[PDB]
Amino acid sequence: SQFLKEELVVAVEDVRKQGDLMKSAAGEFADDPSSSVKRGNMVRAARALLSAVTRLLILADMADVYKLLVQLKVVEDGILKLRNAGNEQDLGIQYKALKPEVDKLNIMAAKRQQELKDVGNRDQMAAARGILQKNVPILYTASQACLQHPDVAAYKANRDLIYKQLQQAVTGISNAAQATASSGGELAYALNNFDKQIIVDPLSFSEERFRPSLEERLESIISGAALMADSSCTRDDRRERIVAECNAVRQALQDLLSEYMGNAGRSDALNSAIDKMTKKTRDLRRQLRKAVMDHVSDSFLETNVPLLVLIEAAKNGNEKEVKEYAQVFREHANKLIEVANLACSISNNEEGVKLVRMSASQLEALCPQVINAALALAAKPQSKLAQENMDLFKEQWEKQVRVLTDAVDDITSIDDFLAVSENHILEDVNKCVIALQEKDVDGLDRTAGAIRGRAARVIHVVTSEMDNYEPGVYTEKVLEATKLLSNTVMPRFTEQVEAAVEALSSDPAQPMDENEFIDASRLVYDGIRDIRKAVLMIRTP
């Protein structure tokens, strides 16, 4: 940092000389507000002084990058040392001297991130700083669990996983800072392309052998749409409708194909075909929206349930049940990630797609860590620190699930969720009244749980999409309907269901009032519908 200092003093002397020149020229113009020459000399000095100041400030930029490289190498060595800890005394010291350098690095890297220009590097820098700050205090506890219970290898796997993520964050900072030289969804991009790429006459030899076949674009679009509609998370309803829409958007293209193949005239018969094609593409767009809303309303319930089953089986020292429920938990996490990926696919917003994919990837990286933490707790169940690790990883899991949930909420339309959840909760209150009408205790319990979960989901979604607007009268009425369904309708419905289940599962079968139960169910539905209409007022399209 010495050559930089000398050349920076050089540049600052340059800048002071230019400032003297600029002051002289400006004082000379200040006398003649009319001389087009004094004005010319003023601007000619301004440009050169601006160039000199720019030289100096880019020297300062290079100096800050120089400092950040060695700070990053310092924290790299510190991470390597905190990993290679011997006992809880050397480890407890490596942390009391790494946090200062970690914080200095984080601040300098935020500075350099604000100094960047390319936004991909901005986000790489932000994610690297975030992973750094999240994993250093977690690498501490992982190394502590390694050194206290060295008999379990799951702790070693977690220590090494967090160390690898930390080194990846180090290298990400390095490249996002050093490299100073120089966005919608996948299905939405191709859908808008195919919407616009059907306006040219392809009988010519200029866009039938160079540009892609207007059939191949549709075929890859169908590949994506049937990838979504074949997901294990898709209902049969959306699947049938997506099949219908794919076969109706291939018929509107074959109609358009036989319209452009026989025209080749610079025509009107093909305007009907292009309008039909536009409308069929818009309809398949809407159907993919309906399918992803199906996914959001369905799979985003019982969010932290496999985790709870896993930790409850791991609190009891079990080993094979832990592996079974851990494979199940990995599967459910991958189900969440697949749903988030489909919703990222059909989405147009550039920022939301990035947040969704990044949060889902972080949750995917967290999945094996909490699996190993549950395994290591079950391996040493009568341990304090294993219990603490399990608690920490369960809280991390709940937080990551909540942030992925909010990302998918904000990346999608509010009233679409309102309507799909309204119809689903109607189907479910019907399932509930039916399970009661035949005294099906299991069906009644399951359906009431589904109804309550969907209600709480809708309340969280409505309160999340209600903060995007200013505190006003519309928000007042909407949040009033929300808290009314909150503190009234759902507790009443729950008490009704509990009374019915108690009346069924008793030594004397008690004839509960079947009338008020149905009233609480229809109250759930009508509250959902009321809130839906309340949110559906401040917009006209």
Added chain:
Amino acid sequence: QFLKEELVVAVEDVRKQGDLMKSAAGEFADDPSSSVKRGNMVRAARALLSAVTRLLILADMADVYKLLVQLKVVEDGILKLRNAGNEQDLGIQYKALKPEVDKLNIMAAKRQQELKDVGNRDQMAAARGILQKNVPILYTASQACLQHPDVAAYKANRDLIYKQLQQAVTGISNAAQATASGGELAYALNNFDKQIIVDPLSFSEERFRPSLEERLESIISGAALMADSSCTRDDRRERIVAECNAVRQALQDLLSEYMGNSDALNSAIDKMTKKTRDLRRQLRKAVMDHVSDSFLETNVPLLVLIEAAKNGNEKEVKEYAQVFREHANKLIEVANLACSISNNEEGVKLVRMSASQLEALCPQVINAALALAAKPQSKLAQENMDLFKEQWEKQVRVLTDAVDDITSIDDFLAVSENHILEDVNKCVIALQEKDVDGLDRTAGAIRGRAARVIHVVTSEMDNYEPGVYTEKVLEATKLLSNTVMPRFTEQVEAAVEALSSDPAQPMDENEFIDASRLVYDGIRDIRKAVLMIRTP
């Protein structure tokens, strides 16, 4: 000019900030090792930079407004120059215009070199060049519309020039205004080659497919413009399509290889760079293809139109105007194509400026033919056609030598040698088949391409300074011109004489083939001589 108030505001601001920065820099240099004083120096430097950049953008906006007012002045003065009724009033409006038009041209040059864009730069350059070259032409068009008020051709020409100047001033307005954002296709091609790789480990399959696929498709469109062109050989565009499919396959292969991560995937990247370089070479070969194949006959439709308009035919001169327009468009195509792939930025600017100038000049010669066919006896028709043909041939050779200086000479020599070998075999086989039109056309083509070679090597050997390398190739070119073309034109005309007559005598076919192999070997020899610069 009412903004000078904010100017003095920003001047006082910049003075205060510069004094503050000089004080802070003195504090730093007096204590060269202080994290606080250095920080304050940098803070003051950034504040001073913000102040002087505010001042700079204020000055640029003042520049822009004064240019807008000058442009409105020139526009209204041109409106006066067109509607002038007297030659006295036309002279007075031109007297009041010429300095104001020069002022507008200088200001437009300033705001062109100060444009934050690279394309609107060229647009306004061409527009103000049109305004620079056509106002003195509107003067004479109006003088000849006020001196022959009967011939509607003179009025059509005057008003065509007026509409062109109005397009020029509106273009200057639109270009210098909206600064809101090498060559057309070469830029995207080199940036494709820049974006082929980024980061192996943090590589997402759904974050780079848009960039790479869309870049590939834009490149494919830019190359299809050149391959599927009015003047580009069939085999050439088939070769281009082959290389386009190859580069598409290579892009998809590079995508499927970046799906696996950074070891064995280097081969896919090398194949990608190979395919993009080979497509670059095929496009350059296509440009060189329609250079020798289109620049050999420059004044043909002009000459035929001039003769058929001097004779006064109406239908003939109209068909010749259409062939003249087809020729001008066929040449503008080659201009834009050779521009879109060259990295010589200033050369591209010059070529495109000359190309738009000639594009505007074409309908002027059209209306000159209009004036000649309608009044062939009239005194002013001769001078009108003479001026416009002079300007036309001037701009033709200007665009020729302008594209010559963005086109590598060695590729020109290669494509010219292969093309004249092709035409010489055509000529031989037409002499053995005894085709009078065949020999006529083939000898014309060979002689024209040889003259093309002569002109390009003459215009290229002046960029060097006379030495052994200079004279060694100058001798070959002089030998070609003053030896083989005589001995070839002589043989082919002896053929068309003895064959297209009664005796049908064998026109000494061995000497004919001797002259043909002579012209091939002479072009090849000039090539071999001038190619003694470097090997890598």
